Structure formats: structure tokens, C-alpha cells
Ligand binder design. Sequence first.
Ligand code: Y6A
Ligand code: Y6A
Lengths: 306, 306
Amino acid sequence: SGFRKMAFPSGKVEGCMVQVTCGTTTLNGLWLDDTVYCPRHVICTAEDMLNPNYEDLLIRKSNHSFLVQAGNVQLRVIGHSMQNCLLRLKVDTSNPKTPKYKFVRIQPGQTFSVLACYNGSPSGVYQCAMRPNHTIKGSFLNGSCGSVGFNIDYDCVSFCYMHHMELPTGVHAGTDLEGKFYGPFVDRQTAQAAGTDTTITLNVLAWLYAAVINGDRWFLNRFTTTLNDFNLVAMKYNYEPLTQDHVDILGPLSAQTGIAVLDMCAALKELLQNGMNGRTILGSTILEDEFTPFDVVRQCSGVTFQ
Amino acid sequence: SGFRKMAFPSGKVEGCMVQVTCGTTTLNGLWLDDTVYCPRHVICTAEDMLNPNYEDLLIRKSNHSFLVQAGNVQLRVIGHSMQNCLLRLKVDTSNPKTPKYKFVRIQPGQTFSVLACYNGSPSGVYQCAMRPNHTIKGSFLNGSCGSVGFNIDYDCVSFCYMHHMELPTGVHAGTDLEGKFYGPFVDRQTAQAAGTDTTITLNVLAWLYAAVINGDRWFLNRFTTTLNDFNLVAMKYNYEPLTQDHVDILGPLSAQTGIAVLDMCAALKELLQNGMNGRTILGSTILEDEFTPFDVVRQCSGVTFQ
Ligand SMILES: O=C(Cn1nnc2ccccc21)N(Cc1ccsc1)c1ccc(-c2cn[nH]c2)cc1
Ligand SMILES: O=C(Cn1nnc2ccccc21)N(Cc1ccsc1)c1ccc(-c2cn[nH]c2)cc1
């Protein structure tokens, strides 16, 4: 029993973090096989960031412009290229700790584990959702750039995020491991800001199912709803519209609890309209949206507490 | 910026988890040097748990009664002893991945990282406070026994918890790595229950300081309080009394923010009396108590956003 914001074990990623220095600038890189990946802003001075031309800043660098430090060990850079907003450094040594891995672009509303790192040394691990507005509510200080996000499935690490930026509201922006930004953001100084955000409806429903699996039904009701009637309420409360695809995804949690998805929607409508009346669900006074249906099945018992 | 329930990176602990089997019963052990530590209830059948005599159950076992599996590899057991509620198995092989480590008994209100494990395989990591009633609000299923808690400081792992039990309220109980239970709990079937709990006052104050370091002052006021006047309010709201020792511990956070500890107490009193009036602090609608003053200094900027 219990329900916690649980991260994946971080060992397989720890063995891949290095430090990358170009001139005065140090940040984190990810060392897989004989490649190191890091944010391309490592090549900029503070003043370069106002209006950088990366193509023109990079052609002025050699391989030996880059220092890569793996723990105590200097890795020799023997090649470099830019891929979107990442630099790829080829080094003289294959990482003996390279895990089984893939690069994936996660979708909005999906979750991942962040390994915050400074100076190539891992400092902490926590779980993040990709918000609908393509930001994450992370915890990052200066020096954290090149920290990665990931998911693990049967000893394969799916890398999905590299940290580039803190926006003016204190939320975080970065790239997939092909160096494409999540959201409309750019690695230069602009008036860019987090767009308006929404509550991840599918995740709230998964988390209500979690509460029932763990033995709590106080918030259920004798009502049902159409998808249309639910969505009129969702819009009022700045919830993402529910789609048939989202109903289909909730099929296994619905089956394990015997609560029809639209019967759970009727419960959520009533909670949005009436509040929680001083009660909690899984310890929370608020409706939680940072757990996916996959996260609930991973962490909850396969046997409902009936 | 940001503020997250952050766990330590779990790699150094992952390399120590093994599986321990005695008959039908499998659970997790911790492999350091040539010793494996696990809950002594591994030697019990389900029916043994009603009234076990561990001394009498253990003398009936040989070394070869115990199977220890480190990944793919069988470790041969060559010795065994009981230490309080732990078994210590000596094995034929020293763990090549043994980190620098110590065994520590944490105090109530202190935090640690839990590596949930099943069948010797790590599944997840999250941060826990030791509640005043000596329980943790974990997330554990059947098979999780022998999962450990820890803190890391400069590459030294301080192990402080081993998981033994889920209480009837769904909260968790275990031992230090000398096998002494936290709290009044026992590794046998009784009417035992979590005692009443309290809010960890020192941690709430640390977390208000965190909010100011990250740039928020909405909840401050022009009032001060005596320790006595604060504690009359604390008792009304089921908060731990504040002591002079707790005021002294908050000295560095008070210095970094320029807010006197008793001026912060006056702010907390006002929040307890009046509520938050629909506002948040660091994203929360409630007063958070699972971050220590050490956790705040670890995660927050050393420069206040003034
Ligand atoms: O946001 C950042 C870097 N960053 N990421 N996470 C942070 C958490 C706290 C503080 C700073 C943090 N920026 C701002 C910028 C400006 C144009 S795009 C993004 C940033 C600031 C300075 C540099 C820099 C490059 N060379 N020297 C300094 C890079 C990124
Ligand atoms: O609580 C447990 C074991 N445990 N720990 N975390 C749990 C999370 C979910 C389910 C069970 C969990 N107990 C109960 C008991 C009974 C007397 S003291 C503690 C437990 C239940 C069964 C065994 C057992 C021993 N041999 N075979 C079964 C051990 C502990």
C-alpha cells in the first residue's frame, strides 16, 4: 500500500554523466559508446546568448577547444558536430558503463525521471511530467544544463530529455536527445515565456483509479456522463478535453476496479463542482495530474483492496 | 529555481541489492563486503509469523538453508547469525561494488531515500521522512521486505532503514541496519498500530525559508512571537513544540533570508490560524513537513531571490 511520486533507479544513467568544458563554460554531458551529447550553448559566452549564431560560433572551434572529464579521467575529443540544439563530441574511449538505451521523444502529459547533475556529478533524482505547455516543473540551479530525463523498461534506458533553460516563471525547458526543443522555445535570449497550461485529465482519472485500487471509494457517485457533458465541465475548470482515445487507455484500470470510465468521469465532475469537502485522496487535498495510467499500473497492486 | 521531493542518486545502493531465499520465502538483502543483511522473518512460514521464536526457528537452519542470488550469480552462504531483527549471512564472495558506507540510526523528522526492490531487482526510488510516530509513508507491495533507506554524503552511503512491515493503516515499519526497530513495533503478529502522529514543526519552518529563498514573501507579517506563545498555538494544531535547539538549527536559513526565526514562527502561527486563503507556497496548498533544514540548504540556491 501507499502511493509516492517514484523515480526510476538512476544507476544506469549515473555511469553516463560527464563534464564538458569549452573556455570558461562548464556543463553536463551524456557519454554513450564513443559519443558525448551536451547543450550547444556550451560554446557561448554569456554575451553570445543574446544573439548567437551557432554555425558561426562552432566553425571557430577545434576538437581541442572541448575538454570532457569522466570522473577523474580526461577523454580526448576526436570529432564534433551539431545536431539541432545539441553538440555531439566523438571521444577516443567507449563508455564501458553504456547501458542498453534508446532515444525517444515523449509526448505531453507523459512522465520521466530527472537526474539533476552539476560538474558531471549526479546530485538528485525526481519524477517530472511534461506539461501540456511543453515545460517541466523541475528543480535546477545554474550548472544543471545537460542533466537528462529518462524512463527504464527491462534494463533499457529510454532517454527523453536534456536540460537547456529556466524560463522567467521558474519552470524548465529542454530538448530530446536529437536536440529538438520540446515546445516553441529557443536557445537564445528572447521574450519567450511558458504558454498557458492545463490539467492533464487522463492522469487525474488514472490517479482516482489508483485511490480505488488502494481501497478508497468515498468520491464515487451513482451518476454517469457523456464525453460531451464531461468536456463542458472540463473547459470550465481548465482541464484537457477527454477523448475516446483517453477512455480506451483507461480500459485496464477500469477492468481491475469494475468502475466504467465514464462513471469515473462522473465522479471527477462532482469533485470539480463540489470540491473535496476537507477530505483527501491518497493523502492529497488536491487532484493530482503527474501520474500516467502506466505509472499507476507500475506502482499499484494488481489486486484491488475491495 | 523550483523545489521537488528529491532522492539521492541510487546507483551506489543498486549494486548492493540481492535476493535471499529460505524454503518458499524470497525477499531482498543488502550485500556489503562478504555480508548479506536481510529481515530475520525470511526464516518464517506465513503461520510462523503468528508467534515466532526466532532463536528456535534459526538453530534448525544450516548455511545451505539459505540461497543468495546476486543478479545471475549464486553466492555460497558460509556463515549465519541473528543481530536483533536482522539475519547476517556470510558469503564466499566480497561485493566488488561495495561503496564507502556507514550504518546510522536516523532520528524522527529526518529524511532518507528509499530504493524499493523486489526479487533483488531495484524498481523505484523516492524520499521519505521518519514520522514522529516512527513510521514512514512509503509505497511497498508484498516482496519489498529488505528494501533499504539511505542518505549519501561525498560518496559515502549512510544506510539507515531496512523494510520489515506494513501496518494496518498502510504505513511502513522497519529497522536500522543493526536490526533495531524504529518505534515500538515487533516482527510478529500483534494488535500493533501506528501511534498518533504530529506535524514536524522544524521542517515546516525550513520549507517556509525555502519559499523565501526562491523569491516568495506573501505569508510573512510584521509580528513576532515568544517560543511559549508559539507552542500554545502549535499544540492546538497538532504541531511538535518548538524548542531552542530547533531555533538554533534554523540559524543559517534565517541568516540567508534576514528573517529572524521567531518572525518566521509568527508567520507560521498566522498561516495556522487563518489558512492560506486559496494561495500556494512552492506550488503547495498545504504546509509541507517532509523537508529538513539540511534538505533545503542542499537543494536551494545559496543566493536569495530578493
Ligand atoms: O536558463 C538558462 C540556463 N539555466 N538552465 N537552468 C537554470 C536554472 C537556474 C539558472 C540558470 C539556468 N539560461 C538562460 C537563457 C538565455 C538565452 S536562452 C536561455 C542560460 C544562461 C546563461 C548561459 C550561458 C552560456 N554561456 N555562459 C552562460 C546559458 C543559458
Ligand atoms: O507487513 C508485512 C510484510 N510486508 N511489508 N510490506 C508490505 C507491503 C504489502 C504487503 C505486505 C508487506 N507482514 C505482516 C506482518 C505479520 C507479523 S509482522 C508483520 C508480513 C507478512 C507475511 C510474512 C511472511 C513470512 N513468511 N511468509 C510470509 C512476513 C511479513
